[PDB]
Write a protein that holds these residues in place. Structure first.
Motif, short mmCIF file in Angstrom:
data_model
loop_
_atom_site.label_atom_id
_atom_site.label_comp_id
_atom_site.label_asym_id
_atom_site.label_seq_id
_atom_site.Cartn_x
_atom_site.Cartn_y
_atom_site.Cartn_z
N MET A 2 0.83 -1.20 0.00
CA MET A 2 0.00 0.00 0.00
C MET A 2 0.86 1.25 0.00
O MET A 2 0.68 2.11 0.87
N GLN A 24 -2.76 11.28 4.02
CA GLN A 24 -3.27 10.94 5.35
C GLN A 24 -3.53 9.44 5.45
O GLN A 24 -4.65 9.01 5.77
N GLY A 66 -5.88 6.58 4.51
CA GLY A 66 -6.14 5.84 3.29
C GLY A 66 -6.92 4.55 3.47
O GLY A 66 -6.77 3.86 4.48
N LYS A 67 -7.75 4.22 2.48
CA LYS A 67 -8.55 3.00 2.48
C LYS A 67 -8.22 2.20 1.23
O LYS A 67 -8.12 2.75 0.13
N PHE A 68 -8.07 0.89 1.41
CA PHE A 68 -7.60 0.01 0.34
C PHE A 68 -8.43 -1.26 0.28
O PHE A 68 -8.71 -1.87 1.32
N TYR A 69 -8.80 -1.66 -0.93
CA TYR A 69 -9.51 -2.90 -1.19
C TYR A 69 -8.60 -3.87 -1.94
O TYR A 69 -7.80 -3.48 -2.79
#
Lengths: 525, 155
Positions: free
Chosen positions: B67, B74, B75-78
């Motif tokens: 990632m 500053q 996160g969102k991950f799939y």
């Protein structure tokens, strides 16, 4: 060049000849009879446009001035006639003696109309000549006149007089008299005006103006240097602080502003201590002392908050508790309610361990909506939500509230929050060394990541250390070298189950200094 | 851009009558077989329409689960496990749409790439929105993982 008006009275007297000097510049002495004439000469020697106006009474001018067999009267007449030769403008204005409040009102109107009809830059009240009566009344009324004409003429106003009672005597009846300048007394009460404004409402307008004036007058004589005066910096920081409070903003900037205010305050006070005078030093020292008292009283300090700007902690909770108390004190109720909501959000993040996303708003909402201490926190939640929307929605549809019941509700929240704060006194957390998402090969996943600072890294690292909940997975050695060289189990094994939380770092060491803790990582799926 | 509007046409049509079937027809909102047949063939016609009518951002190429967000983020991950065929398909989609930012750092990876699937720009970043592909570990032993862990930052 400036345009200048000198206002004096003119009463019966002997009008001896006097060596007037400005006490600032004893070099220039002017030997005349009228202090206003000496002041006018000192000002025309400065390349300004000067005019003098005298207030005479019928009892004075048709009984003293034009009495041709009074030696003192003809002396002062000859001086008033030769005033025009220096390039100065002289005129006369009739007034009563002021024997009652009606006549004093008349005199106030006369002075006020003169100040309105003046179209120059500066006006000087010369209280040397005339009745003691008139000098006292004018000295009392000058501050009212300034406050009146702040929005009328934008006129500089001075109060001076020849203090002939304290003058050196050089020859028979000949005196060396200083023109004293008590204009600093005018802006002596403005100091306390600023103090009340800030102490009760947190308004910085008076404070900023006063600080700018203070730095000017301490820059009059250059014994005091900058790099620690920075009253300009303090005024700017006060402006920023007011903008931060009346426009709600994160706790990080508020704590930084309070820390900056404290640092600049003590630095500037220590610097100002070493300046020995030419004006009133003591009252402004008292002013700074009082403002430091109020700053250390009403502004809560926490010197070491700025280091945790990306997360939610308990220190931020108590800090915002004190901040909301301050907001209530300054009658800033709406901002107080708005800050209370986010403080409650942070408290439930702490109580549910979901504090990774203090920089993500979807999470904030999703747990804005969805073993006793949970029950007490729900108690407080239901209490606060029972009355927030009256403030939030403007009171439409017959659902407003007075100040009394709002104070009621706010202290309800205060009591319960202090309660649960005093009452609030750790899953498996692996340890990684790079940004990764290794899910077991049989998994179908959602992952959250947040940049961090080094202090938070250290804190949660030792939390993992001494809760037995650390599954450390460092695969090589120099990592541990930097670990013990900076922060004071090399199980080189490859997995991330949905729910486990872990820590990360990516790249002698001085060059490096020229990243050390960040990218905390957690699988919500 | 019309096809979104036609798909919205079909969406609104279908949602206009789904809840009669879904909610059991309570509150005076049921339907006979005739009008339900009506509606179902409406859906059939529009779906065949838009299916016949339906005939690519920058997609980097990685080689491990990561990632790496820019240091100022500053996160969102799939992440999703995949099979090898899907891997190959989207890989060549990246190849011949000019939208591939390949980031393979070593060589035997390309050896297996051309030995199995028929740009070694060894550069380290993941902006929120970019999509990328991943693989983790002669080759028969291996056979005894080849495409999985497709990765995308929704934040």
């Amino acid at each position: 060049m400036k345009k200048i008006l000198i206002v004096s009275f003119l009463g019966k007297g002997r009008y001896y000849e006097t060596f007037y000097y400005s006490i600032e510049h004893s070099e220039k002495m002017v030997k005349k009879r009228l202090s206003p004439l000496a002041n006018a000469i000192l000002e025309k020697e400065n390349g300004n446009d000067v005019e003098i106006i005298f207030f005479v009474t019928n009892e004075v001018k048709n009984e003293f001035l034009y009495d041709e067999n009074n030696e003192y009267a003809k002396n002062i007449l000859n001086e008033l006639n030769e005033i025009k030769n220096y390039g100065i403008k002289v005129s006369y204005r009739d007034i009563p003696k002021g024997k009652n409040y009606e006549e004093l009102e008349i005199i106030m109107e006369e002075i006020e109309k003169l100040l309105l009809d003046f179209k120059g830059n500066k006006v000087i009240f010369d209280l040397t000549h005339g009745l003691r009566h008139m000098a006292i009344f004018t000295s009392s009324t000058v501050f009212y006149f300034k406050n009146l004409m702040e929005k009328a003429n934008k006129l500089e106003m001075k109060i001076v007089y020849g203090a002939y009672e304290i003058g050196e005597e050089i020859e028979k009846n000949l005196k060396k008299v200083p023109i004293l300048d008590i204009t600093q007394t005018l802006e002596l009460s403005d100091l306390t005006i600023a103090l009340e404004e800030f102490e009760r409402y947190g308004i910085t307008e008076r404070m900023i103006i006063v600080l700018k004036n203070i730095q000017k007058i301490v820059a009059k004589n250059k014994l005091c240097n900058l790099n620690e005066l920075k009253f300009s910096s303090l005024s700017r920081e006060l402006k920023l602080f007011e903008e931060l409070l009346k426009i709600p903003s994160p706790p990080e900037k508020i704590a930084n502003s309070i820390y900056k205010i404290n640092d600049i305050l003590e630095s500037s006070i220590r610097e100002f201590k070493l300046c020995s005078n030419l004006f009133f030093i003591k009252p402004i020292q008292k002013f700074l002392v009082d403002f430091q008292k109020i700053v250390l009283e009403k502004l809560p300090l926490d010197k070491k908050i700025n280091k945790y700007s990306n997360i939610a902690t308990l220190e931020k909770v108590e800090f915002m508790k004190n901040i909301i108390k301050l907001l209530i004190n300054w009658k800033m109720y709406s901002e107080a309610v708005i800050h209370l909501r986010e403080l409650l959000i942070d408290i439930k993040l702490i109580e549910n361990g979901k504090y990774f996303y203090y920089n993500n708003k979807d999470f904030r909402e999703k747990y804005w909506m969805y073993k006793e201490l949970p029950k007490k926190i729900e108690e407080l939640l239901k209490n606060v939500k029972g009355w927030r929307n009256s403030v939030a929605h403007g009171g439409r549809a017959n659902t407003s509230i007075n100040q009394k019941t709002l104070e009621e509700n706010l202290e309800n929240a205060l009591s319960m929050i202090d309660e649960i704060l005093l009452s609030m006194k750790s899953k498996k957390i692996y340890l990684l060394n790079s940004t990764i998402m290794p899910i077991p090969k049989d998994n179908q996943g959602k992952f959250y990541i947040l940049k961090l600072t080094k202090n938070e890294f250290k804190v949660i690292l030792e939390n993992a250390i001494k809760d037995d909940v650390l599954d450390s997975a460092i695969g090589h050695e120099s990592v541990i070298e930097f670990i013990k060289d900076k922060f004071e189990p090399l199980k080189r094994k490859e997995y991330f189950e949905k729910g486990e939380s872990a820590l990360v770092i990516k790249l002698e060491m001085d060059f490096m200094e020229e990243l050390i803790g960040y990218y905390y990582i957690y699988r919500e799926g």
